[PDB]
Design a protein around this nucleic acid. Structure first.
Lengths: 129, 210, 53, 54, 44, 60, 148, 167, 50
RNA sequence: GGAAAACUUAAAAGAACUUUGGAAAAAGAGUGAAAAGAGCUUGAAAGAGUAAUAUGUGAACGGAUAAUUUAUAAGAAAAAU
RNA sequence: CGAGAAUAGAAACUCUUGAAGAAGUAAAUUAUCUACCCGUCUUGAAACACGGACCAAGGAGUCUAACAUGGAUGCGAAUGAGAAUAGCAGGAAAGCUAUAACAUGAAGAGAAAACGAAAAACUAUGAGAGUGUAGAAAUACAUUUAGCAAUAGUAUCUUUCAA
RNA sequence: AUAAACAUACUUUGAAUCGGCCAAGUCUGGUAAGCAGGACUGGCGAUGCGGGAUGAACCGAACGUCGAGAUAAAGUGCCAAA
RNA sequence: AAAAUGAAGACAUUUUAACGAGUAAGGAAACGAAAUGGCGUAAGGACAACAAAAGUAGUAAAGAUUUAAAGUAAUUUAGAU
């Protein structure tokens, strides 16, 4: 069972004039200029973030697989989402070593918890093995 | 903790005093431990290293033994004849070794190491009699209050108190209402997690009994 | 105000002392997080050493 | 009693004597002063009587 | 309220800070103790 | 640099946002500056009624 | 707490909450109480209507210690000794011992007459007395004593 | 669009105890439940007054409790505020329920034979309010209220914040 | 009994906590994905409701 | 009056011999855990060079909607009596 | 013929496509529609109005002192006394203790001398609590009592030439 | 008569602002002015959208993100939907 | 906004109804039915494997370059080098 996750706008809200100057990054900033084309909602350039774009509360922050995210740093972190394995999914942190990742992956299979980094930091077993 | 106001616990001032230490104080820093055979003969733990002293390397790639050919107090290193590297074109050069990674096996004792090894021996004995004197007074006080017991009970295994008397205080009812939201959700999560761990152990025990 | 009894244990032998001691009334004071936060916010700045360019 | 080692300081009383809400709830239920719990009725959706015969 | 602040003169060089206050206590106490040691009823 | 002198434009719209504050009832009940003899008559009766009331309160 | 100021909520707005037409300039009409009679006159008139001028006579070297005279009303006399002492001597009269409420020891030099006294005799000793204070003390059945 | 008189803004009534005091929050829950279930105007009044700020919850002294309770002998004064002690006048016997009792005020009520209840004990004894006398303190006796307004006014002048050369 | 959320699986001789049951008392269960019943079969002479 | 300029490695073990070249250097070889190769920890943006791919009549860039190409990416259970 | 009401009545499905890559998403290109240079003073700028070649890093409501309002806090006719300062353990720029000078307030008016507050108050409207009846589900009417806050008006009292 | 309980009455603290411009079944000075100055209202400023080819003010109508349907001003030979 | 429920769920509770343009300007923190909600930089005090070895780290940290995902957005998360 998994609901239909509907996104109202799948594009990116890019900062105005970010495509013309390299000093203006693409992270959004509301234009406060008194003569700004975008902030006056001219035809053609009237795309600003609003609360109306917010996705449905039921299907918010939900990964495409149908579950949520729950970062783990060791095996004991998995024990917090073993009652909710139909709701959460383990996501090993980026700094966790390869030796510790095997223990988490091995235990999470025991507890029937999905891991979203199941093929992360794997050894060189890709050629000649 | 340090209680002397004259010395400083600043890492920046510690390193600076190390790099600007004169030749007199650079010799005491270059000290190595005596081997088991030499420790039993002289009852000395460590002495500053010397030329023609034989040592054995205990940390590093090669644990060879040799004779100290150079003590370089400016670099804070020493040189061993055995440990050398050929300098590409064919000639060999010594490899520096920190004195703390070697232990002395044979001593070069002309006339002053006899003075030093003797002086460092009486110091060891005089401190042992001081520790012994203090350790007997602590024992003398402990028995004066617990005559049936012995001071040796502290060096053995400890048996915890198993009694679990509870106390009724009219604040346990509010304990969850005195928690902030960040720390209440963590407290209740740990409760729910522990119950699940306790429920599985109960289920496992039934199968083991079965 | 019963103030229940509190047991005193021996640290060496582990045997509880035969005479319990009543719970002092300071343990029934109101537990105010806000008032503590007021005081702790202030007193935590009292160890600071002067600085300046 | 006023403190001896802290002149002028006395332990305060909480805003409530017994900081528990349960004993008051059971007293009014015993005294039959509380109405019954209410579940909000399901509000029917608007229909078109000119076309929906039901 | 009509403000009355006499800051129009150079107040920055008129500032006296009491950072030596915790150390005055130790200094005076050590002299009081040393006085009694020297000749005890001199600090009487 | 001549400027416009005065305009009533937007003054009635401004005046009706928080509209005309009527006075309270207590504004029409003031008696300062009334007739001198009428004030004397009213005070004489009030002092007579109050004294009688307080005398009765003292009896009971 | 500089993280709770308004500067942190106005990062991004150009004028930092001071307006575009009327900028935030150095002065807004002078330095201090300037223009007390020219362009801030409507301010001093409105909020300090007696700021300018002179009144009363000059005292070249005032002695503020000579005007020091703490005062206590009659209704607050018995608090100087306590409600427990007051109840102890509640049923006394002329002839037997009555507590003496001295006020100079407590720091009050004058006794004024306001409020009511408990219907008991008392001996009030102070430096100065009021005309209505002494009436209320004597009517209750007490005495007035002077000091210094 | 639609032509309204005004747009919906937050109503300026408090509906919870201000601050983080755990006990005052518990009282709001206790009387929010009582007002909702019993549907009594008394519990609505206590719930409304518990959510006023400190400045709007003025104190009532034992002198005012004594006078207001004179013709109410077997009654319980209910004041949602601190109760201070008027040392000038005697304290009769009375049962008072209040948020806080001053050390000197509580000892004066207790010694005279009265009882100093809190707001949980009152809800246990008179939840809907049956032998209660609602009492609140004066608000206009604050020293701030003197200085509000224009002191140049002809009718009710203000009180002139003092400062430089205030003759 | 077992919690409703607990579906034990065999451990490949790996490290498991003290509370987790061992292999000898774990019997695996086939994953079940079909929860809707199929269509019924009626008489050949009668017409379908659909 | 009055600046700028910090960092190889654990250790110089700072390539060392051959071929091409007038020489500087380059290509091998070698040291080192790793060139980190002395313009030496990492190495961003602006600006170039090489490789792959795509587009084209007096600006260029952005947005909505589709098409084409490429990439990502959803499963091992199982019917009626 | 027949509403109400009473008695008996029945819905569980198909086909296509997808790990030989379904549904969606991203990037590039093409096509239709659409799109004037940002910041700024200005009634009004895309402006033939000014600054801006490009990138990185630095870059502008801060601190001290006095007052007021307001939200949380402690105590309450008191509050503070981390005023100096004097002690304690511990070695401590931290912590604790100090029947204490004083600061603000408890009393106000007058330039000053000289004074220094009750008829143990009154009137109006107002918060709350019961009882009964009824609709009948909630809830509405009648009656008894209470008079807080607040606003206004008053009698009385202190000071002033004047309230 | 009609409307009005997120009604009504406010209290305190404070920001910005007082260069304005336009239209008209209006007026005064002027030959007149996209000139100067006023009375009442609505706008622009602070405002995008559909229409007038283009336009600060005109006409319709004032804006959370969208799907479908009737519409407004105004249009229906092609650009351009009819 | 109003009803309902309420020691802890969770998505800052459930239901119903109305509403949502905007320059200058305002809405400090906290406030269970919360008197606007949040993201980011650095430093200080605590918390971070509850059975006596208790956050991550040479089985690869920080940083950098990119590929994808979550969020209306500020930004966050993970893979590869």
């Amino acid at each position: 069972i998994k609901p239909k996750i509907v996104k109202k706008y799948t594009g990116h809200f890019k900062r105005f004039d970010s495509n013309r100057f390299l000093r203006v990054k693409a992270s959004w900033r509301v234009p406060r200029g008194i003569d700004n084309r975008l902030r006056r909602k001219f035809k053609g350039t009237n795309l600003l973030p609003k609360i109306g774009y917010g996705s449905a509360k039921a299907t918010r922050n939900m990964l495409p697989c149908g579950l949520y995210k729950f970062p783990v740093r060791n095996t004991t972190d998995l024990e917090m989402i073993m009652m909710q394995n139909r709701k959460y999914a383990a996501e090993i942190s980026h700094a966790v070593s390869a030796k510790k990742r095997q223990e988490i992956i091995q235990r999470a299979k025991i507890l029937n918890i999905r891991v979203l980094n199941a093929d992360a930091r794997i050894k060189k077993q890709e050629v000649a093995q | 903790m340090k209680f002397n106001c004259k010395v400083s616990s600043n890492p920046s001032k510690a390193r600076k005093a190390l790099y600007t230490a004169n030749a007199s104080q650079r010799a005491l820093m270059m000290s190595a431990r005596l081997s088991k055979e030499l420790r039993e003969k002289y009852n000395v733990i460590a002495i500053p290293i010397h030329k023609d002293d034989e040592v054995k390397i205990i940390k590093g790639h090669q644990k060879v033994a040799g004779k100290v050919t150079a003590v370089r107090r400016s670099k804070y290193v020493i040189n061993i004849d055995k440990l050398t590297k050929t300098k590409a074109n064919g000639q060999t050069v010594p490899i520096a070794i920190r004195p703390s990674n070697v232990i002395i096996t044979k001593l070069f004792l002309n006339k002053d190491r006899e003075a030093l090894l003797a002086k460092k021996a009486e110091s060891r004995k005089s401190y042992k009699e001081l520790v012994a004197k203090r350790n007997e007074e602590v024992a003398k006080a402990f028995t004066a209050v617990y005559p049936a017991l012995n001071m040796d009970i502290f060096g053995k295994k400890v048996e915890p108190i198993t009694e679990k008397k509870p106390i009724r205080i009219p604040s346990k009812k509010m304990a969850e209402k005195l928690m902030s939201k960040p720390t209440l959700r963590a407290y209740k999560t740990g409760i729910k997690v522990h119950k699940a761990k306790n429920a599985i152990a109960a289920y496992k025990a039934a199968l083991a009994k079965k | 105000s019963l103030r229940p009894f509190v047991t005193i244990y021996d640290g060496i032998t582990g045997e509880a002392e035969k005479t319990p001691v009543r719970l002092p009334a300071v343990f029934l004071a109101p537990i105010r997080g806000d008032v503590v936060h007021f005081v702790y916010r202030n007193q935590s700045k009292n160890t600071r050493q002067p600085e300046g360019v | 009693k006023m403190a001896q080692g802290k002149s002028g300081f006395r332990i305060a009383h909480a805003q409530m004597a017994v900081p528990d809400m349960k004993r008051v709830v059971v007293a009014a239920e015993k005294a039959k002063l509380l109405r019954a719990k209410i579940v909000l009725p399901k509000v029917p959706k608007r229909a078109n009587p000119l076309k929906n015969w039901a | 309220a009509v403000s009355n602040i006499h800051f129009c003169k150079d107040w920055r060089s008129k500032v006296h800070t009491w950072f030596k206050q915790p150390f005055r206590k130790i200094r005076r106490h050590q002299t009081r103790v040393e006085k009694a040691k020297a000749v005890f009823p001199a600090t009487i | 640099s001549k400027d416009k002198n005065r305009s009533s434009h937007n003054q009635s719209h401004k005046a009706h946002r928080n509209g005309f504050y009527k006075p309270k009832k207590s504004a029409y009940m003031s008696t300062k500056g009334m007739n001198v003899q009428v004030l004397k008559n009213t005070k004489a009766q009030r002092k007579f009624a109050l004294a009688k009331k307080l005398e009765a309160k003292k009896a009971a | 707490a500089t993280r709770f100021r308004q500067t942190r909520r106005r990062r991004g707005h150009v004028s930092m909450g001071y307006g575009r037409i009327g900028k935030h300039r150095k002065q807004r009409g002078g330095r201090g109480n300037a223009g007390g009679q020219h362009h801030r006159k409507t301010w001093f008139t409105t909020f300090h209507p007696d700021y300018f001028g002179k009144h009363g006579m000059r005292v070249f070297h005032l002695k503020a210690n000579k005007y020091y005279c703490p005062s206590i009303n009659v209704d607050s006399l018995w608090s100087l000794v306590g409600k427990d002492v007051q109840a102890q001597y509640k049923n006394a009269k002329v002839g037997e011992e009555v507590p003496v409420i001295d006020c100079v020891k407590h720091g009050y030099f004058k006794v004024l007459g306001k409020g009511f006294l408990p219907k008991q005799p008392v001996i009030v000793r102070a430096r100065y007395f009021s005309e209505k204070a002494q009436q209320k003390i004597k009517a209750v059945g007490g005495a007035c004593e002077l000091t210094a | 669009a639609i032509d309204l008189d005004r747009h919906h803004v937050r109503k300026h009534v408090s509906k919870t105890a201000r601050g983080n005091n755990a006990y005052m929050k518990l009282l709001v829950r206790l009387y929010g439940f009582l007002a909702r279930r019993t549907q009594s105007k008394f519990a609505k009044t206590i719930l409304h007054r518990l959510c006023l700020s400190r400045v709007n919850r003025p104190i009532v002294s034992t002198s005012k409790l004594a006078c207001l309770m004179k013709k109410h002998p077997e009654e319980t004064a209910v004041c949602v505020n601190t109760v201070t002690y008027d040392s000038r006048y005697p304290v009769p016997k009375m049962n008072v329920c209040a948020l806080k009792f001053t050390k000197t005020a509580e000892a004066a009520i207790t010694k005279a034979g009265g009882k100093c209840l809190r707001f949980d004990e009152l809800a246990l004894k008179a939840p809907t309010g049956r032998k209660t006398v609602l009492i609140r303190g004066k608000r206009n006796v604050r020293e701030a209220l003197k200085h509000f307004g224009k002191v140049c006014a002809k009718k009710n002048p203000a009180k002139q914040y003092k400062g430089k050369q205030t003759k | 009994s077992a919690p409703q959320w607990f579906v034990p699986v065999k451990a490949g001789d790996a490290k498991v906590p003290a509370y987790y049951p061992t292999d000898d008392m774990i019997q695996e269960q086939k994953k079940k994905l079909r929860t809707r019943k199929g269509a019924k079969i009626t008489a050949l002479d009668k017409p379908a409701w659909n």
